[PDB]
Every structure is written in C-alpha cells, then in structure tokens.
Symmetry: C3
Subunit: 153 residues, 3 copies
Amino acid sequence: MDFRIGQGYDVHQLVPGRPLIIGGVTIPYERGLLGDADVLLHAITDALFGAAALGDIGRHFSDTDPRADSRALLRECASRVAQAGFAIRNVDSTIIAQAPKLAPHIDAMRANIAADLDLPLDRVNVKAKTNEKLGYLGRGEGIEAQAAALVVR
Amino acid sequence: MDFRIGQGYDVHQLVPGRPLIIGGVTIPYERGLLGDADVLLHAITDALFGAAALGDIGRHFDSRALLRECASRVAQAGFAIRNVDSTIIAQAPKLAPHIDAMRANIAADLDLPLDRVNVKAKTNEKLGYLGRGEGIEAQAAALVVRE
Amino acid sequence: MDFRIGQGYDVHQLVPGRPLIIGGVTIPYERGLLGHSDADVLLHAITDALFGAAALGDIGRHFSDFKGADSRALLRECASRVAQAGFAIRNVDSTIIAQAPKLAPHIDAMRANIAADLDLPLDRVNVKAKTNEKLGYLGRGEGIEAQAAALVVR
Ligand SMILES: Nc1ccn([C@@H]2O[C@H](CI)[C@@H](O)[C@H]2O)c(=O)n1
Ligand SMILES: Nc1ccn([C@@H]2O[C@H](CI)[C@@H](O)[C@H]2O)c(=O)n1
Ligand SMILES: Nc1ccn([C@@H]2O[C@H](CI)[C@@H](O)[C@H]2O)c(=O)n1
Ligand SMILES: [Cl-]
Ligand SMILES: [K+]
Ligand SMILES: [Zn+2]
Ligand SMILES: [Zn+2]
Ligand SMILES: [Zn+2]
C-alpha cells in the first residue's frame, strides 16, 4: 500500500559534567552529551516526522515551548504520526561513538524505543560504530546518530 | 509491489560573493555555496537515481532543471516517486522560515503533492567544518515503486 | 507486504602499504584502507544496512572484530542470515565518499560484486561516488566513508 520512508540525523558534543544518556539508557562514563541530549532518540523522532512529512523535531517540540525527556518526545511523535494516518513498520539506526563500549546497552535501547513506539522488538534495531579515530567523532568530542524509519498509510 | 529505496548525500563549501540557494530558495546570507550548488536538491537527486538504480548525478549531468530531468529519467525507467525526506545540516543561517517554500519547490519539480515531500534542518552543534560554517550538508531518502 | 528498511555507515583510515579494496574491487592506489578484515568500507556499510533491516543487530555482533577476512564472504554470510531470518532483499543503494582515487571506472564492477553476493540482478543494486568537496578529514584524503540503504521484505 502507501509506504513512506524517513531519515534522521543528530549530533551532540561530549563533555565532562553531564551524564551519558543514549536510547533512554544512562551509561556510566566520565562524560556526557550537551543539549537530556539523547542523540539516538532525537534522530529516530526526526526520521518518523520525516516519513510522515510532518516537518521536524524542532517544529513540533520547540526549545521555547512551555509544553520533557526525549522518550516523552518520542511517544508524542508516534501519536502525531498515528493521527496523520501512518502505522510504523520499522526503525533502524546507528550510533557513532569512539567510546564507551555501547554493545552491552543495545538491547536496553531497543527495548525502550520499541516500548515508546508500541512496536514488537523485532521491528527496532540499533547499531554502533566507531569513527576509526577520524575527526571530532574519532577524537571523542561528540557522538552522532543516524536513523531510518518506514511507515505506511 | 516493486518498491525501492534510495539515499543521497551532498556537501558544498560556503564562500563569499555567491548567493545562498537551498531547495531552490534564495536565502539572504553573507556567503553562498560553491559548485548553483543547491546541496539539498543535489542530495535528493542522488537519492532518486539511487532508488531507480540509475547511478548518480555525476554520471547523468540550475539545480531545479536538473531535479526535473532526474524525475524524467526515473519515470523513463518505469518508476513512480512515492515520497522524499531530507535533512539540511547548517550552523547558519536560520532555515526555519524557508522550509515550507523548499518543500513547495521540490513538490512542484517532482510533480508530487506536498504531503509526500519533507525537509528538515539541523545545526552541527559547533562541531567540525559544518559547526564552523565552512560548508552545508544535505541528506536525502526516497521511496519509489516500479509499476 | 512486510517491508523493512535498513541503513549503514562505515569509515576507514587510508594508509600506505595496504591494498585498496572497495566493493570487492582491488583498485590500483598507493594507499589502502586500514582494518582487521580487508577493511572494505562499502561492503561493511551494506552489510550493516542488511542486518539493520532484518533487526539482527550489526556487523560486530555477527563477525567480531576475521583477520584480513574477505568482506565479500562476510556479505554473503550476512545475506544468508538475513534469508534465514525470513527476509528477501529488494534493493540496495550506497554512496562512497573519497577525495581520491577516481572511482567511476570501478563502480560498475562494485555493483556487479554486490549483486553477485546478494543474488540480485544488477538493476536492484546501486553504488554512487562523491567527493567531500575538499572538506574535513575526507576532503584531506585521510579516510574513505560509505553509506548504504537496503529494503527487504519478510
Ligand atoms: N540552520 C538551521 C538549523 C535548524 N533550524 C531549525 O531549528 C530547529 C533547531 I535543531 C529545527 O526545527 C530546525 O528546523 C533552522 O531553522 N536553521
Ligand atoms: N572519488 C571519486 C569521487 C567521485 N567520483 C565521480 O565523479 C563525479 C563527480 I562528484 C561523480 O559522478 C562520481 O561518480 C569519482 O569518480 N571518484
Ligand atoms: N562505541 C561503540 C562502537 C562500536 N561497538 C561495537 O564494536 C564493533 C566495532 I566498529 C561495532 O560494529 C559494534 O558492534 C560498540 O560496542 N561500541
Ligand atoms: Cl574531497
Ligand atoms: K557524516
Ligand atoms: Zn539532539
Ligand atoms: Zn552538490
Ligand atoms: Zn569497516
């Protein structure tokens, strides 16, 4: 039927003094993202609004708007996607971070995302990459996330 | 039915004495893209050629005329365009007031209704060449179907 | 009707003294990609996109970083696991970003390798090449990046 695709990007700086929260999971580390600055949840939200052609995360959830962590935002995104007429079919994503090791936390992130989107676990995927010591990502100065989402009207 | 996906990437340097044109919209700014170097339309063009497996922009070829030709070639290969999504990564200037016009431009060029075309914008949080405003990146995804 | 999408990203450093192998093609060049396998950045990105579309995690889960491993053999194994999970591949698209060397003379060969490894006809596989317009570590030729997207159906 009426399938649509969306894609999402996000990046935040990595500094001492903030906790590291990615995909709703708090990961012990000497440093955290500046923004809860959940780079993975933001990229996924963008991908979803994109698939539904609803603009972007900033247009829905403004820095200034009096009307929240990134999971609340993800859930509101999904309701808006639903109300627009679209059912979510799957999400895939990649986190690019030189450190720390993310593999142990992947199932936790998938579980949070699946819960927030009301999806079966087998329709949510999260992957992790280093940047092979290249650029600001490779130097541990920031963390990037990429997302793809498929929906149907 | 026979769906296919494509993905596109483009980046251009920001330089003095060039108009800034993105998604076919002229945006007032001290610099512009070097190449009309419309990074957004180029990424979308590559995503569409990718979905139709027709190669890339460099193997085929202003950017709106090129986007129209791309759409022509896609249809010539037997595909219909179902939707486009995209992200512009620019530290500056503010793109928000220009986005709906970009969507309208793309929709017109692809012969698509507005609700099948999306454009999003992000800064780079002051990181890398994007963060320093040395260039602007675009990413695109397209879904087509062979009927 | 049960379609799924996946996306993939990879980057490797370019160093002297290594073969340059992208899309399974050995490309004449004074530097090659550094990695534990043959460091084929394009095949790895595609492999990740396919595992991602099937929700089977990532290339590191399946093939733990394989010393000098042929990344085409890895791609074929990935395709096998994707099929075993119940998915057929419908198409792959990809972009390589590199300052140098010129990739255009090798693109059709890369496409042919990928099609062979995924048992797809050529018309469902696409490879695009881009410079990074002189920007950043890619612009300085310090590494090569690949991006991929895949559509599958269960
Ligand atoms: N150069 C930019 C970057 C981002 N935005 C908008 O500002 C928000 C902040 I991420 C998003 O809604 C985005 O659309 C913008 O208007 N101009
Ligand atoms: N390293 C590169 C980068 C780009 N190109 C080709 O040159 C054109 C110019 I963007 C594109 O079509 C692309 O296929 C190439 O042959 N080698
Ligand atoms: N920050 C990171 C980066 C990567 N990995 C895992 O390590 C492998 C080496 I690229 C990746 O494919 C992924 O499986 C990880 O656990 N944490
Ligand atoms: Cl370059
Ligand atoms: K990038
Ligand atoms: Zn964010
Ligand atoms: Zn361009
Ligand atoms: Zn690799």
